[PDB]
């Protein structure tokens with residue numbers, strides 16, 4: 001009931017009762033808020049409401065102080081002071097951006113733009129409010145009850161009337177009952193639970209409604225610049241493998257935090273594990289939002305770092321299968337690999353946070369709260385995919401607004417830039433360099449002469465909203481007959497429904513653009529499916545085509561992105 005103002009830290013008993021996070025607001029800032037928003041309920045030890053029996057006046061602008069009690073204009077005593085006077089709300093110990101964050105529905109892009117351009121304390125308020133609004137929104141969808149169990153990987157379901165049905169993709173992990181978490185894909189719905197239980201008919205699955213904890217630590221700690229490497233001890237016997245990053249590792253020891261922008265295949269994993277070989281005594285915590293990103297870092301460490309000094313932290317509510325070669329849950333091992341949401345309360349000499357475009361300000365703050373380190377290193381690429389914002393429907397979110405780190409990388413630029421792509425054929429590197437990296441990404445490989453583009457709009461069908469283009473899958477099928485080396489290709493598309501149709505017809509392994517991020521394949525077959533804002537997104541486009549080591553076939557719908565592709569044009 002007594003804390004500090006979320007706008008100027010001025011100690012106060014006042015909290016906004018109309019805010020879903022009930023932030024402490026000082027007399028000056030509380031007034032500026034209630035006089036401009038629909039928010040008029042003010043909370044103290046006792047609420048600011050009319051004390052007169054059966055009176056429902058709760059608006060602080062319509063209330064007055066009767067000695068030590070509160071009353072409306074109809075019930076106030078002769079000697080009373082309005083709670084709102086001279087730019088203040090009465091309380092003990094006696095902003096336009098805060099009003100917008102506190103009242104927005106988080107469905108517009110301008111809401112997220114503001115959540116990142118605001119002050120630091122408002123970035124945490126925006127992050128808490130957004131995350132709590134994302135969870136209260138989970139109470140809105142309808143329950144699915146089992147009607148029939150077809151097999152071990154398929155079932156038929158009954159849906160709740162009056163409440164809408166949620167998107168059937170691997171993104172929306174349902175929580176079933178206490179049989180564990182369960183996922184779905186499209187009347188024969190394919191079921192895939194984290195736990196393998198012979199599902200009983202009549203059982204029900206409901207979405208993961210978790211409670212949002214408050215944020216204390218900033219998204220980014222205040223920057224410090226040092227004259228020498230601080231708290232870290234370099235090697236002199238440094239493997240020629242990592243000699244290219246020595247100057248950047250030294251810059252890491254001479255700053256509190258450092259940003260590394262690394263386009264696809266420029267050596268981000270290599271940079272992260274080499275930093276451990278450069279400061280060999282340093283205790284490093286490797287973190288990322290996804291289990292896949294943390295696992296990718298584990299594969300690189302297995303190759304260069306002693307397997308005994310490594311540990312993979314796995315939480316009890318195990319949703320996906322993880323890295324199995326390190327000792328599990330040993331918080332004290334020199335090298336700790338763990339996802340943001342499972343981080344223990346520990347300290348480190350260096351913290352490395354990878355796949356930084358996928359992080360939210362909620363995640364940035366959590367890392368600063370659970371880990372107290374001498375140095376922080378943010379590795380990622382603002383030209384790659386951000387975390388999905390489930391409430392955002394109106395407008396497109398730009399990279400300088402993904403999180404505080406991406407905002408820094410897109411405005412002041414990154415501290416370090418890995419400029420040479422070692423993975424992709426030159427056709428792909430030249431296209432993405434011009435598309436998203438301002439011609440600064442250089443190709444290490446020559447042109448493979450296996451990068452093709454075909455302009456084919458086909459026919460667009462929709463399974464609810466995930467789009468399908470059967471003629472584009474047919475064009476791929478025709479190409480494969482004439483190109484058997486492409487038999488070993490991974491099929492990629494912006495839609496899971498397209499991928500389900502392509503897996504049945506082509507039999508190729510399948511990946512959405514979003515789930516392909518971080519991975520690499522010799523051959524990639526990409527069908528754009530539609531020319532929507534989703535499939536034409538340049539960050540998704542950049543990710544889609546930078547998955548290929550040898551060859552890529554792009555069946556395009558957008559003339560703009562087709563014309564930008566510096567690939568060999570095909571006909572049929």
Ligand SMILES: O=C(NO)c1ccc2ccccc2n1
Nearest residue numbers: 244265266267270420421422
């Ligand atoms: O070792 C690596 N991964 O296997 C790697 C990848 C990409 C690189 C790019 C430039 C310099 C070095 C690199 N190293």
Ligand SMILES: [Zn+2]
Nearest residue numbers: 005008026029
């Ligand atoms: Zn204040």
Ligand SMILES: [Zn+2]
Nearest residue numbers: 016018019039
């Ligand atoms: Zn409010």
Ligand SMILES: [Zn+2]
Nearest residue numbers: 050055072075
């Ligand atoms: Zn009253």
